[PDB]
Design a protein around this ligand. Structure first.
Ligand SMILES: Nc1nc2c(ncn2[C@@H]2O[C@H](COP(=O)(O)OP(=O)(O)NP(=O)(O)O)[C@@H](O)[C@H]2O)c(=O)[nH]1
Ligand SMILES: [Mg+2]
Lengths: 173, 51
């Protein structure tokens, strides 16, 4: 459906998948950390003049069961692959997450995807140089965006840009 | 909150059955749509629980 875009948040624990989701959905941000099992949301938005809906599936940083993870990943239309700029290990984890996505959607050529470096408000704690993440995203053929779920910086941008990638794919079919 | 907690349990049972159905299956968009729908209900029920 060109009027309903299915977005999955993917990335390791604590990087801010839920914080980005809840900032986008409700303009809320809390400092608490409650690990996700799985949550989902639907919002009406206007995307480049057209009224559409975005569905968001917010995943666990580590899923107990491969089948559950595969079921979720296979159902997505586009992915926000999130790491925290303050945790280099979360950046290295994105490579394996991407492989899992590609494997479960093997019949699709170019999967809508953005790499998101979150917690940009914590610049003084950065462990991932901007150039390292930009270079990796270029190697994957996708946009790199740095966000802060806390301050709202580039939060709408990552969801709207991913929706534009999904819309482009849908029109090409 | 007993009523909400029991409905969460009911929807979790349905979520588990949909995961069972979907695993290793022929692509089934209708069942995927129901999976996200059940999750949306679960998320809404839990939001109500926390005030
Ligand atoms: N300063 C700051 N803190 C953030 C930001 N995004 C998330 N956090 C904080 O980081 C912690 C983890 O956030 P959360 O959204 O739960 O991360 P998650 O990726 O959903 N974790 P999980 O995989 O366990 O569900 C929380 O304490 C949250 O407040 C951000 O942009 N800036
Ligand atoms: Mg979470």
């Amino acid at each position: 459906s060109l009027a309903l875009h299915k977005v999955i948040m993917v990335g390791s624990g604590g990087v801010g998948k839920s914080a980005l989701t809840l900032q986008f959905m409700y303009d809320e941000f809390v400092e608490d950390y409650e690990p996700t099992k799985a949550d989902s949301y639907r919002k009406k938005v206007v995307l480049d003049g057209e009224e559409v809906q975005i569905d968001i599936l917010d995943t666990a940083g580590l899923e107990d069961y491969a089948a559950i993870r595969d079921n979720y990943f296979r159902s997505g239309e586009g992915f926000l692959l999130v790491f925290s700029i303050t945790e280099h290990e979360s950046f290295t984890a994105t490579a394996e997450f991407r492989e899992q996505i590609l494997r479960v959607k093997a019949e699709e050529d170019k999967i809508p995807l953005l790499v998101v470096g979150n917690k940009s408000d914590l610049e003084e704690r950065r462990q991932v140089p901007v150039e390292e993440a930009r270079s990796k995203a270029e190697e994957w053929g996708v946009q790199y965006v740095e966000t802060s779920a806390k301050t709202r910086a580039n939060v709408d941008k990552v969801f709207f840009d991913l929706m534009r990638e999904i819309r482009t794919k849908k029109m090409s079919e | 909150q007993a009523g909400i907690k029991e409905e969460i349990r009911r929807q979790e049972f349905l979520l588990n059955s949909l995961h069972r159905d979907l695993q290793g299956g022929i692509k089934d968009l209708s069942k995927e749509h129901r999976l996200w729908e059940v999750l949306r209900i679960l998320t809404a029920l839990r939001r109500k629980l926390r005030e």
